[PDB]
Amino acid sequence: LIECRCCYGEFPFEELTQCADAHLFCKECLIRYAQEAVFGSGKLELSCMEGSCTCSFPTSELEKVLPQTILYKYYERKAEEEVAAAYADELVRCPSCSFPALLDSDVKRFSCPNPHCRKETCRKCQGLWKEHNGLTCEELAEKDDIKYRTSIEEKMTAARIRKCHKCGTGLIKSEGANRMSCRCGAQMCYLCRVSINGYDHFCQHPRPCQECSRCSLWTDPTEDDEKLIEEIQKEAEEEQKRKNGENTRIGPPLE
Amino acid sequence: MQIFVKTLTGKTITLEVEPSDTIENVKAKIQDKEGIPPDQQRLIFAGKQLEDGRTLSDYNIQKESTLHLVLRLRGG
Amino acid sequence: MQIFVKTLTGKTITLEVEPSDTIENVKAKIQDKEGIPPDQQRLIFAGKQLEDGRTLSDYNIQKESTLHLVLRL
Amino acid sequence: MAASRRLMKELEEIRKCGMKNFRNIQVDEANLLTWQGLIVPDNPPYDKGAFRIEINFPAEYPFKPPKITFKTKIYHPNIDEKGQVKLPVISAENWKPATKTDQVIQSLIALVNDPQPEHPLRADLAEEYSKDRKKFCKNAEEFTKK
Ligand SMILES: [Zn+2]
Ligand SMILES: [Zn+2]
Ligand SMILES: [Zn+2]
Ligand SMILES: [Zn+2]
Ligand SMILES: [Zn+2]
Ligand SMILES: [Zn+2]
Ligand SMILES: [Zn+2]
Numbered sequence: 001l002i003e004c005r006c007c008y009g010e011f012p013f014e015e016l017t018q019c020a021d022a023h024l025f026c027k028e029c030l031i032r033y034a035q036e037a038v039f040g041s042g043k044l045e046l047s048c049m050e051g052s053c054t055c056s057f058p059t060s061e062l063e064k065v066l067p068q069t070i071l072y073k074y075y076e077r078k079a080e081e082e083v084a085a086a087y088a089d090e091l092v093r094c095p096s097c098s099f100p101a102l103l104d105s106d107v108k109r110f111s112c113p114n115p116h117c118r119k120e121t122c123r124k125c126q127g128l129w130k131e132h133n134g135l136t137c138e139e140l141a142e143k144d145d146i147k148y149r150t151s152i153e154e155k156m157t158a159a160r161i162r163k164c165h166k167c168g169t170g171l172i173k174s175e176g177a178n179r180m181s182c183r184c185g186a187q188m189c190y191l192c193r194v195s196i197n198g199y200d201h202f203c204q205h206p207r208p209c210q211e212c213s214r215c216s217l218w219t220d221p222t223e224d225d226e227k228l229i230e231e232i233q234k235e236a237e238e239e240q241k242r243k244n245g246e247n248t249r250i251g252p253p254l255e
Numbered sequence: 256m257q258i259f260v261k262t263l264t265g266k267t268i269t270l271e272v273e274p275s276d277t278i279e280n281v282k283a284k285i286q287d288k289e290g291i292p293p294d295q296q297r298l299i300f301a302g303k304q305l306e307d308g309r310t311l312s313d314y315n316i317q318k319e320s321t322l323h324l325v326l327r328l329r330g331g
Numbered sequence: 332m333q334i335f336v337k338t339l340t341g342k343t344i345t346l347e348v349e350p351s352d353t354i355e356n357v358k359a360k361i362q363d364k365e366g367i368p369p370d371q372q373r374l375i376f377a378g379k380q381l382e383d384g385r386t387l388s389d390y391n392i393q394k395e396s397t398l399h400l401v402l403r404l
Numbered sequence: 405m406a407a408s409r410r411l412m413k414e415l416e417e418i419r420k421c422g423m424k425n426f427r428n429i430q431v432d433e434a435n436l437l438t439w440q441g442l443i444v445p446d447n448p449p450y451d452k453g454a455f456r457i458e459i460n461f462p463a464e465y466p467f468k469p470p471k472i473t474f475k476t477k478i479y480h481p482n483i484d485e486k487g488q489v490k491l492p493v494i495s496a497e498n499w500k501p502a503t504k505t506d507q508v509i510q511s512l513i514a515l516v517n518d519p520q521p522e523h524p525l526r527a528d529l530a531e532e533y534s535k536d537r538k539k540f541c542k543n544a545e546e547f548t549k550k
Contacts, residue, residue, distance in 0.1 A: 005502055006406075006410070006466060006501055006502060007406050007409055007410055007466075008409055008410055008413035008414075009409060029406070029501075032406060032467055033467060033501060035292060035295065035467075036295075036464065036467035036468070036501075039263070039290075039291045039292060039295040039296075040295045040326075040464070040467070041326055041327070041328055041329075041468060041496060042467065042468075043497075047500070048502075049500055049501045049502035050500065050502040051500050051502060051503060051507075069290035070290070072290075073289075073290055076264065076341070077264060079337065079339075079399055080264050080265075081378075082375055082377070082378050082399050083375065083399060083401060084378075085375075085377075085378025085379075086373075086375040086378050086379070086380055086399070086401070087373070087375075087380070087401065091401065093265060093266060093267070095267060098266045098267050098268075099339065099340060100339040100401065100402075101339075101401070101402050101403075101404075102373060102401050102402060102403050102404075103403075103404055104404075107404070113402060114340075146318070146319055149317065149320075150319055150320060150321065152301075153300070153301045153320055153321070154301075154321065156301035156302045156303075157299060157300070157301050157302050157321075157323055159302050160299065160302035161299055161302070161323055161325050167264075168265050169263050169264070169265070169325075169326060170261070170263070170299075170323055170324070170325040170326065171325060171326045171328050172297070172299070172325050172326070172327060172328070173328060173329075173330050174327045174328065174329055174330070175329060175330055176329050176330020176331055176471065176488075177330040177331055177488070177490075178330065179330065179331060180328055180330075181328070181331065181495070181496045181497045182326075182328070183326065185497065190330075198523075199490075199523060199525075204524065204525060204526060204527040204528075205527075205528075206484065206485050206526065207528075217525075218486070218488075225302065226302075229301065229302045229303075233301075249315055250301075250315075251300075251301040251303075251315060252300055252301055252303040252313075252314040252315050252316075253313075253314075253315075328496070329462075329468070329469075329471070329496060331471075331490055331495055331496060
């Protein structure tokens with residue numbers, strides 16, 4: 001009748017697991033903990049859930065309890081965060097094979113080295129470089145409806161999804177302050193999308209702030225981003241109708 | 256139709272769906288092709304959350320459109 | 332000593348090297364094993380860029396440790 | 405749900421071991437994700453009043469931290485005018501799922517007892533506390549009374 005310290009349910013010894021400090025948890029709680037760490041908001045290191053334990057769950061218990069897919073994705077995310085700690089947010093994956101590669105962020109000629117891929121693309125619009133010659137991303141998108149619709153959809157996405165400057169993960173705010181702490185350990189601002197250095201980035205003058213030009217901590221940029229998305233949609237429809245030869249919406253309903 | 260899905264790590268997976276397929280089916284295919292539990296999948300299309308009650312046609316998701324998986328992070 | 336080098340696609344190439352082997356030697360072995368030119372290889376251990384002048388014992392790369400391999404232009 | 409099991413257990417443990425400075429705990433058994441209660445501090449400058457607070461647990465609890473909001477106004481460097489608190493032990497970056505509400509409340513009471521003006525939400529009050537605690541304490545006593 002051993003009681004798990006996380007979910008508080010009672011189980012036998014066979015349905016339990018431990019860390020290096022012999023803390024007892026149920027296997028399902030460890031599974032959900034690893035799930036929140038991998039496919040959710042949580043720390044990478046699967047540390048022992050108890051604060052008194054600086055140790056973590058041993059890799060043997062992880063390989064015995066966690067399913068194969070969860071463990072594989074955990075190793076993948078560990079590699080992702082190590083790449084983030086190494087070369088920051090300069091790793092780009094090919095649009096055709098997702099093969100990661102490093103570039104100086106000054107050249108857009110991403111030639112996928114994978115012999116099963118080897119596709120020349122443009123890292124700004126994911127467009128083919130042989131067509132992209134002599135033309136900008138705007139023009140290459142306007143040269144086709146399949147390109148332009150997807151480009152407008154991606155613009156509307158980027159108008160809301162905020163990328164992390166470390167692991168490159170996309171974030172949205174459910175509620176609370178405008179300070180975002182990513183699951184990789186990097187902090188950013190939800191108003192300026194800049195990697196902040198702490199709480200000295202926001203304004204703390206509650207007495208309209210005309211003593212510092214710093215971002216507010218509680219302002220909701222929901223309406224501004226929504227209006228920008230709607231304007232992108234409307235202007236894209238206008239452009240399509242203006243360069244459509246008597247031809248026939250790009251994006252979800254605007255509510 | 257062929258659509259794409261951006262995972263939280265940043266990879267692009269390819270899905271083959273129908274306009275009448277629901278967000279539940281889309282998340283199930285995402286789980287089959289990557290292992291992400293649908294309860295932890297937060298989907299965004301053109302800056303709009305994809306609710307399970309609706310369907311792809313309710314969001315005007317056409318061919319070669321790319322959905323994105325993002326984090327529903329709190330504020331502090 | 333046996334170490335592992337995991338690439339970005341997930342390929343785990345096993346290497347037999349000594350703890351006092353330079354990262355330049357490790358990248359040369361990676362080249363003659365897979366074909367990746369050393370001027371394009373970037374090895375990472377615990378989030379630190381491994382310099383071609385340091386050695387496996389400088390970063391204290393122990394037995395059966397994993398090194399993440401990324402590619403440059 | 406794990407959240408429901410864990411919060412019913414924690415509530416059953418609090419109802420047996422009542423907390424000293426956290427009283428009048430109200431939780432609808434039909435919605436375990438919101439708790440209301442009264443913080444009753446022991447020391448000046450806050451020990452002449454009490455403060456209503458609310459705890460909101462995410463559906464993913466205990467794998468994500470709760471949030472605490474003060475409903476009563478309080479004069480404190482680490483609590484803003486809307487009652488939001490940045491209690492480090494329940495920050496997303498520090499959160500451990502084994503942390504229980506009794507520890508969260510103890511941490512909150514320790515913060516109330518000893519402000520941390522180096523990392524404030526109200527820099528004015530943090531400056532006043534760090535420069536002249538006697539003055540800060542008088543201001544806080546008056547704010548508690550009012
Ligand atoms: Zn449990
Ligand atoms: Zn432990
Ligand atoms: Zn490629
Ligand atoms: Zn381009
Ligand atoms: Zn990140
Ligand atoms: Zn900002
Ligand atoms: Zn200000």
